[PDB]
Amino acid sequence: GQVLFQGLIYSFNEENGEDSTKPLGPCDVFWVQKDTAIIRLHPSIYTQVFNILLQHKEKLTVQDCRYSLASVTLKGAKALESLASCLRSTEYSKSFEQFKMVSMITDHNALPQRCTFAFEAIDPRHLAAPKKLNDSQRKTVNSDDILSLHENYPQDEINAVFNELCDPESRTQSYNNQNTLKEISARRYKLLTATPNSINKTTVPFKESDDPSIPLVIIRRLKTRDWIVVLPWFWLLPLWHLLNRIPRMYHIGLRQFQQIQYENKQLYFPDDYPFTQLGYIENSFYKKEASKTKWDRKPMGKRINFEKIKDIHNTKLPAYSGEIGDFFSSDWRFLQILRNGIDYLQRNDKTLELMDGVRDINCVNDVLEFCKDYEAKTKAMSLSIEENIPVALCKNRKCQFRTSFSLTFFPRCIIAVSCTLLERGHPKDNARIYQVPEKDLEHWLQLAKGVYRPNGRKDHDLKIPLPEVHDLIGFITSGTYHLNCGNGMGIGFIDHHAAIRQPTRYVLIRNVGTNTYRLGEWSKISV
Amino acid sequence: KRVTKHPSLKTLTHKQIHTTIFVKSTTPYVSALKRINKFLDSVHKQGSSYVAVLGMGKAVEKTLALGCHFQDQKNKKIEVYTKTIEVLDEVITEGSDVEDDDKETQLKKRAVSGVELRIYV
Amino acid sequence: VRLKSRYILFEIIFPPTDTNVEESVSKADILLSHHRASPADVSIKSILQEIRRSLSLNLGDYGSAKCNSLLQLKYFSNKTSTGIIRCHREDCDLVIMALMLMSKIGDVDGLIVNPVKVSGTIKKIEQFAMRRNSKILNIIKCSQS
Amino acid sequence: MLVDLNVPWPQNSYADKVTSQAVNNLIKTLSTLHMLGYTHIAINFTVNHSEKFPNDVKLLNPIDIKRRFGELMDRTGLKLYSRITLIIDDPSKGQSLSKISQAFDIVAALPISEKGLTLSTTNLDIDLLTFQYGSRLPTFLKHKSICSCVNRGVKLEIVYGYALRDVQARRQFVSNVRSVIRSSRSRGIVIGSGAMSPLECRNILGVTSLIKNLGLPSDRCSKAMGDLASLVLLNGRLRNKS
């Protein structure tokens, strides 16, 4: 079906009969003619992809496209009605016959997954004004047309356009006669005097000899829910101009791109992904140094004091006395070492003690001191020697999720979940995710059901049951007020063992400076 | 059997979408009242006369409740129409171990009855 | 810079003090019997003088001196008995307590003053007055049946 | 929502029978209350501690809300509750609450002597304690008994209606309300409207501004007036039923 998908890429490396793979990141793979495969992804990781590809090129041909093929993204309901108002056809084709009817659908989710329209378009500088297409059969649009769209498909012209765009000879022949703005101006000035002296035409007809045919591709993405359009590098500017000329189209940026990706359920690669190598490395680095510069920039008595915050965890221990993790970044190394220590405590005894060159660790303070000592040793040298958190969503189904004294050798799997706030509260980035304890389990259930005042309104001005310290099972990476539902959406990553531990989906959320615990429920995300 | 349901085809030009509220199954009552009041106040600036209230399936009951509210509360003429809505569903047909989401998708039609509720000013 | 203003909306309500006559118990009936009309001897300078006298009589000398700096009646008509009193954001409580402690007009007796809306701009006051006037018509239309 | 729990009934003793004019004036006052905007109404009935309580159960309440105000309750859409205050002077001719607490809903007291304050703080199952705001307060309000009666649950009631009667008693009312605000430390302060005529009725904004200028903070006013009044009503209902 040659449909475009958005999956997770890996770095494979086999030297002699051995196979060790590492989490790489995202990628977009597309097949054409069962041989021509295009792979598009982030440049920073594209370098490594190209390297690991070129190292194995004995029976394969590689072609880089960094300054000869470009793609631009359209989002919204009326995104295809403007792309159609800009694009025109040089010769009759069924691709355009389907695209014309698609432009009137106005609903992207109603269309099926397989939707790829490619043809040869005219240069957008040729058109004077973005004239809209014929709108007369707008009322007679039923589901039979969408049913027939899956059957009727001109594969031959699609493959021809794809081979023209892939081959570097036709791609260069497209630049044969690229008329200048002065050329088009003179042609439009001389179209004033034509043979039919009854109709005023502000456009210029197409020529099969002295005119360039431009190959274009349109694909729809299911995960991101957007329409990507691919066009040569030097041809993107004339299309981009006429696209922006539509007075309902604004330019979206990387910040707003991350916002749109976070809004639905999705994730951003460098900022959100905590388990890949380069993404997590650069996340930890840039965010930690930036927050530390903003922190040390301010003087004493002007910044929030993470060191001195009382009543954060019941039965406070004299180890940190402030924040349990990192004051600036959402650190998963501390979470991993702490959970490893707690697991060792459960493996040595049924109960755990709180207060009392490897030491016989008998309390939580001993593990907190080990974490602090690891951080004090890391103060000077690089971090992330092996990893902190992998992601194993399929491995548990494949064989099993399986549970010397290192405390930092084996990592802990996490699942991508979305926890939503069901009550008063506002989340933020680098937030802490705790699990509801067993003793005060009915109080949170009654609060989630309802506790009102004699006046009638809700009642949350009560004493909260501050939980213990060994209950942190996750960190929120994308904390922003959800505007699509009216509440606080939290995008975090919780442990699978702790997910199977609880019999309920209730989870507490806390900030990095705030000492309040909000309640919510999480839902799994398959990304 | 795994089967997914997509929304129904909506072809609204520029103003049918503005003066129309699509009542979901999870849409609250008071928020619907607020949006209906806003639409009623913005109609004559959009240049229409009535406000469309479309709901199908589970939300039909509370859509009729919204209609009956403004029926006598504000004394505004309401019109109830019964229409049919066709929805396309992607089903998997039997024909190693692949992903459940990445299987053979076949489109199937399903007709459901719905209520359109117009409110005058 | 900006002068912090705070307008005050008040209503003159006449309780139907007549124990010899039986009355109808409903919403619109009592709304009509309480919003009947204002007497002819009602104006802006007659209400301003009365409130100025009551302010000095209840608060005192300094209480009237601090409050009478920006005490003006911007909009008032005797057909609907709705007035907008401008004052400072500091002395809003004083003006509200004086409007509560209003006993009677020098010639017209048997009336109460109800402060409804307090805001720092006249546009929101006008919007709230229009909303209240629209709400009043609903119970009237319902009871006319 | 608002709660008014100090509407007086035009009857002091048991012997005097009520007239139609008094009932009409009470209806006028309640209709004015509902017009200004209120939710809960609890009319009060004054009686003396020396007057002989009848040995009945179905005759203790000369109000009969169901036959008189039950039709207004259905039409205008409000509710009514029964409340009785105890004008206590001397510990004699008393020692009976298990029969007066089941009939009425809210039980109040009115001490006018120094021994009355002790008897109210020690051996009375009451919810609110009120003073004669019109005339002089009996001896002196101190923190000693006020703290011990507020820590258990008894609040102090303030009648903002008594000020609207004349001009001379306004000074005494202010001197008593500031005293009780200074002594109670602004925790258990409930407000009530003791007006029998519709010409002495006010709204929430004016009363709030008055109590704020008298010495009560803005949060205390709203919090008390709403929640403490609703809680007193709920406690009275629970005392009547279970």
Place this chain on the structure above:
RNA sequence: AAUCCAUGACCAAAGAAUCGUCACAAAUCGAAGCUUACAAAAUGGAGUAAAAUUUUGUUUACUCAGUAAUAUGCUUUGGGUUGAAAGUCUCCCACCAAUUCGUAUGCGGAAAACGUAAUGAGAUUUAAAAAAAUUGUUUAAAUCAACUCAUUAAGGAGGAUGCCCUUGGGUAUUCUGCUUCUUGACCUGGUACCUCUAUUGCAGGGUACUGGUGUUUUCUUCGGUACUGGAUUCCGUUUGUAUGGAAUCUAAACCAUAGUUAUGACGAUUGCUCUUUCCCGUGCUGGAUCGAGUAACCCAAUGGAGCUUACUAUUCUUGGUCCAUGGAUU
């Protein structure tokens, strides 16, 4: 001359955070949001119980989506937003293989009366400060510090010098020198070729070449193309273009994780600066009582960047420097 202590002067950084509460089927000092309509119960759903009917079929009385929705409620933030909102400062917010600053010019930058780096000099006796904006004082004039102006084009290769190091390699400076290549200041005259005005000499435009300062003294904008709100109707089409032509009515384009004289009211908690106290180890953003204070400039009206100018004396603070002085030791 070294170190320490106290004062003063000058440069640089930032503008503490958290929780709860405030009547009205609507409200508040205000604001936004909870709308891609379905519980596969529409391929004319799945079954149970009774009567009658020679089974079908039909009439009554029920079960199933249960993680179920819960009626003016509910969640969020709002005057320094990655410090000045203040200011009669500058600039972007259509394009143009080019009469359109075709500007490879120290670096960064789309631009900026924009940031910064190395060297030399300067003070109404000067390139220019004294007898466009901004600022109460408004650069300097022993030395330092600060302002202004004048030079230094990007990358690769060879030699010399200095440092760790003495196979060798790395960094900094300086000299020779190559690579970085869109037949373009503007304008006049002559010659040669082609097209239209439907024969020619001639009249106008384009291109290739040569010659010249040629009154380019309007020393401040002067080139080309482009209907960007919404509704509906008419007509032609496998003879050609697979889409084009025109018509009627209205006024909207209304948009801020503050948004248009709004940004409220108090209560509670931690932290920050000094002072009168007690303990371990001297000390330790070591701990707890008796107390005082939480600053000033000042405030959005479309958005972003640069610069300048106001602030921090019991009217909160922080870091460093000083060929400034004061005391002591060597």
Place this chain on the structure above:
RNA sequence: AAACACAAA
């Protein structure tokens, strides 16, 4: 009030 100007002062 704010915000604007080859104004005006």
